[PDB]
């Protein structure tokens, strides 16, 4: 909407709005990044966020973006990992044959680099950690 309050005046209106009986909503999407910064001592930030789309008239699609996969079983405790699910599909880094193809798409009509230098740069980054940002730099 457009109303701005605070962490308590607003946090109380969002709790009573998701449980409103007799009001249609839309299939929204929630995209959050870096979950370790939202961790508090009472664990009342990640636990209540996952219980919102588990209601009747709730169309929230949470896209929890983080780093490693063992976070729910390390930093977060039992209540956060319970009401979540085991639907954690990790993404593996690019292979050696994939780094030479992504760089080829960017240089489709750029006649300025030999074929012996393209595979050499994509070889050192593939052995370090396979980061997609450490190859084009």
Q: Which residues are annotated as a binding site?
A: 33-34, 67, 133
Please state the closest distance from residue 34 (CB atom) to DNA, in A.
21
Please state the closest distance from residue 36 (CB atom) to DNA, in A.
21
> What track of x and - describes contact with DNA for positions 9 through 28 (by CB under 7 A)?
x-------------------
Q: For residue 61, what are the CA distances in angstroms to 23, 51, 54?
A: 18, 12, 10
Find the part of the chain contacting DNA (CB under 7 A) among 3-11, 76-84, 108-116, 129-137: 3-11
35 CB neighbour count, 10 Å cutoff? 19
Interface residue list for DNA (CB under 7 A): 5-6, 9
């Amino acid at each position: 909407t457009g109303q701005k309050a605070t962490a308590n005046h607003a946090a109380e209106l969002l709790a009573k709005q998701f449980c409103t009986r007799g009001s249609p909503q839309e299939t929204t999407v929630l995209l959050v990044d870096e979950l370790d910064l939202l961790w508090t001592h009472k664990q009342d930030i990640m636990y209540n966020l996952f219980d919102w789309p588990t209601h009747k008239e709730a169309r929230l699609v949470v896209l929890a973006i983080a780093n490693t996969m063992d976070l729910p079983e390390r930093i977060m405790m039992n209540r956060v990992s319970s009401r979540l699910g085991l639907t954690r599909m990790c993404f593996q880094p690019y292979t050696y044959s994939q780094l030479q193809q992504i760089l080829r798409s960017r240089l489709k009509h750029l006649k300025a680099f030999e074929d012996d230098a393209i595979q050499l740069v994509a070889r050192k980054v593939a052995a370090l950690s396979g980061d997609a940002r450490r190859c084009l730099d």
